């Protein structure tokens, strides 16, 4: 089994306050499930070659999503900024795989990744730990 | 604009503690959003004709589904029981467009469902308020 | 140290729905400190000898206050209800030191407690794990 | 009635990542309730002359309080960092009142606050609404 914890630390009031308005599991590797514990998520995955996605949205209207998962036994991440309301992560999730528009970003197995949306919004998703069964990684809005 | 807030109410500690795993959102009606307000859940969408999911694990394994939206203007609900981990909430909510398995009971409309798991957990949704833009719910295991 | 989790269980929507409103932890032992995860609410102390109040208020606005905590080696629970909006948390967990009205349910050292509100709400506390440092109970408003 | 809702801001992840274990509510004014809403933090308040505090600690250990209130109708607030474990939030809380050693930050119904702890962790409380009887501050954790 593979787990994934993320820190979310918003570093700009200037840009709005983000909260979690979603998140999904993949259904490969027996799927997995997130959880919540001392103000941090983890996904936990049944094995190697599944993800999760959390979508956010600031009280300014902004829409993005953040996925984390593993692939052949490395972790990887990828960030979506600029999301029209119907552009869900029930929509966006599964992109990442059967050849999907993002696949390419899965592959790489990002320890880290960093993307500003169009209208100015800084994301960065940093491993902290990328290695092993236990991975954790800080998420950064700015 | 649409919005069902759901209170999740636990009545038996025989059955194990249930905790949310997923959250999902149908892409239809310009999508939407889970937010979270004083121990409730609240799905807010743009418009008539989409829905969204919640899926709970207790801490005993039990895997399960509960469905709310809103078709054709009117509240709908369903609860799917006896789930596999490969079957998460992003499997099960577009189950219920495009002919998929579970359309059937989204079309009746239901203003209050309940249904008792092979492992022998009772689920219920029951709508408390049933008709305008604001609608509400207890969702109760058992 | 000594920790314990706590499950809370609704099982009555007519009752009303009930959330956390405050949460106190007492100084001795180190103090200690209140943590969710999973949809469950732990207070980890820094030994024996102190305690932590749960106030709650159900959206029908009753408040009632559940304190746990460890004296002498030994878990203890006490509920108070019908409390004025001016009997907070800060003022009821401090009640049980001290000359203070509650302290004789302390030294009770209960790992199981009922009570029912004059306006009518059954509240019990109910420890499935009542022995050694890390203890678990479940919180029932019925 | 007034009510102070809280964004939680925290920018550098070298300071740690900061969780609250701890919410108090002072008795005057009819009491308050604290609620969480979409990621932020709500104290209502009975009315004018009371107050809260929410304890946070970083997952490196760090213990600070942020205290918030209305003081003849109008806002205040303070940070005191380089808690020991026993100075609880039940401990500080009512230092802002009786002669208590604190009191004087209340009077001074300030509608920003910046410190810095001794280890190294700036804080910031900033109103962003500043009058009226819903009030709004940011809290930055740098
Ligand atoms: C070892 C690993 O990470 N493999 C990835 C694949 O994961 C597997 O997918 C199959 C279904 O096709 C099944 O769910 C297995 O349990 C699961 O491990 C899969 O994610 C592919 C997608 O391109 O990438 C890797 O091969
Ligand atoms: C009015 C209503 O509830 N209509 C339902 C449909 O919703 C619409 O779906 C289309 C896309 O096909 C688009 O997203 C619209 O914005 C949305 O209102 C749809 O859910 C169908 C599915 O069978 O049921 C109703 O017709
Ligand atoms: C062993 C135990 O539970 N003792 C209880 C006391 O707790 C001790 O309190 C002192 C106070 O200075 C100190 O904080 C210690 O750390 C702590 O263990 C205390 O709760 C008393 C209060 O009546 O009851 C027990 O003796
Ligand atoms: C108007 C105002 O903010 N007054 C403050 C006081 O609050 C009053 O306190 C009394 C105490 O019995 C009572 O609870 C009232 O409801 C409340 O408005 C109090 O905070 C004092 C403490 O120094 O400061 C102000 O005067």
Chains 1, 2, 3, 4 share one sequence.
């Not at 593993?70 to 972790?75: E, T």
Request: hydrophobic residues 35%; charged residues 20%.
């Amino acid at each position: 089994t593979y787990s994934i914890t993320l820190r979310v630390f918003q570093r700009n009031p200037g840009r709005g306050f983000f909260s979690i308005v979603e998140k999904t599991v993949f259904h490969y590797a027996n799927g997995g499930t997130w959880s919540e514990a001392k103000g941090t998520h983890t996904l936990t995955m049944g094995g190697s070659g599944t993800s999760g996605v959390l979508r956010f949205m600031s009280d300014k209207g902004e829409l993005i999503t953040v996925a984390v998962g593993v692939h052949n036994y490395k972790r990887w991440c990828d960030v979506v900024t600029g999301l029209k309301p119907e552009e869900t992560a029930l929509v966006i999730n599964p992109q990442y795989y059967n050849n999907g528009p993002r696949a390419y970003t899965r592959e790489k197995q990002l320890a880290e990744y960093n993307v500003t949306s169009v209208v100015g919004t800084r994301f960065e998703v940093k491993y902290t730990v990328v290695e092993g069964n236990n991975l954790e990684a800080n998420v950064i809005f700015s």
